[PDB]
């Protein structure tokens, strides 16, 4: 009962062949583990900073969220799904997407600009990784 | 106003030339950060186990509690003072001594049998290290 594109993406997440081209904007502490507004404010902070965004591929699977740098092939983010609490697109930016995870006892929001997809497509993919997480 | 031996030991702790010959009995989780009875029950557990006690020297200073193995010279315990909450001798054993420290969020009690001193002498020395900790 999902949209076709989302049903296909779910297949790709479950076989660990789902990746999206992104700029990784970095991360910022957030004070809550969930909430669309919490993410949207984090992304606003990340966009306001002068730090250079990093081009790469966001791989989504039950094994984790992996961000591989295009320029260097370095694995610059490797996030286990069990520490991720929430993900959302951005009502302020059609390609914005972020997720909240454990930092220790703190929460961090990791922010992205998708190069050629809507943020909600990335959000749904990460939500499929959540499903696999619960299954394991 | 301390006993002479304790005043001298305080001098040795503050110049990092205070050490005591011990058997290190290991450690056991405790559920409280302080309390003579909590330590005495931990030591009872440690004495009941079949694990081999390790002979060495317990060095006491503001820089930490260090246990150096006699046989190997290996530094087998290296405990910062700022993570140690409490120390006490043992009313059940004249040479027993233990301290409670952070494990993460848990508490652990590290237990000792002093080879040729009373446990209360070791306890006072470690209490002097507490004083230095507060000064720093």
């Amino acid at each position: 009962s999902k949209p076709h594109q989302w049903q296909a993406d779910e297949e790709a997440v479950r076989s660990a062949t789902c990746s999206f081209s992104v700029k990784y904007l970095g991360c910022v502490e957030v004070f809550e583990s969930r909430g669309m507004q919490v993410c949207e404010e984090a992304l606003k902070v990340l966009r306001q900073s002068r730090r250079r965004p990093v081009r790469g591929l966001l791989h989504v699977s039950g094994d984790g969220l992996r961000v591989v740098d295009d320029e260097t092939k370095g694995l610059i983010v490797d996030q286990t799904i069990e520490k991720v609490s929430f993900c959302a697109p951005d009502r302020n930016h059609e390609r914005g997407f972020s997720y909240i995870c454990r930092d220790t006892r703190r929460w961090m929001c990791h922010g992205f600009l998708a190069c050629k997809d809507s943020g909600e497509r990335l959000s749904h993919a990460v939500g499929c990784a959540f499903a696999v997480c619960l299954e394991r | 106003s301390k006993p002479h031996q304790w005043q001298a030991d305080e001098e040795a702790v503050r110049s990092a030339t205070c050490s005591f010959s011990v058997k290190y009995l290991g450690c056991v989780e405790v559920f409280e950060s302080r309390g003579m009875q909590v330590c005495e029950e931990a030591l009872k557990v440690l004495r009941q186990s079949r694990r081999r006690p390790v002979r060495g020297l317990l060095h006491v200073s503001g820089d930490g509690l260090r246990v150096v193995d006699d046989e190997t010279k290996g530094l087998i315990v290296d405990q910062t003072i700022e993570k140690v909450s409490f120390c006490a001798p043992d009313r059940n054993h004249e040479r027993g001594f233990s301290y409670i420290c952070r494990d993460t969020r848990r508490w652990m009690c590290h237990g000792f049998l002093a080879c040729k001193d009373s446990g209360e002498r070791l306890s006072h020395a470690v209490g002097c290290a507490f004083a230095v900790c507060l000064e720093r």
């Binding site: 583990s33 969930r34 669309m36 799904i81 069990e82 520490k83 991720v84 609490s85 929430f86 993900c87 959302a88 697109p89 009502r91 943020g119 909600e120 959000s123 749904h124 990460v126 939500g127 959540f130 997480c133 619960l134 299954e135 394991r136 | 290190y24 290991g26 450690c27 056991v28 989780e29 557990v45 440690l46 186990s49 694990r51 087998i76 315990v77 993460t104 848990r106 652990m108």
Partner: peptide, 26 residues
């Protein structure tokens, strides 16, 4: 816009490193 495409992780782990010197309680 209203909130959309938001997901909470039901598998989020809310809830120990081995110490060879540690004695286990019984």
């Amino acid at each position: 816009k209203r909130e959309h495409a938001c997901f909470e992780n039901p598998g989020l782990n809310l809830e120990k490193q081995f110490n060879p010197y540690e004695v286990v309680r019984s």
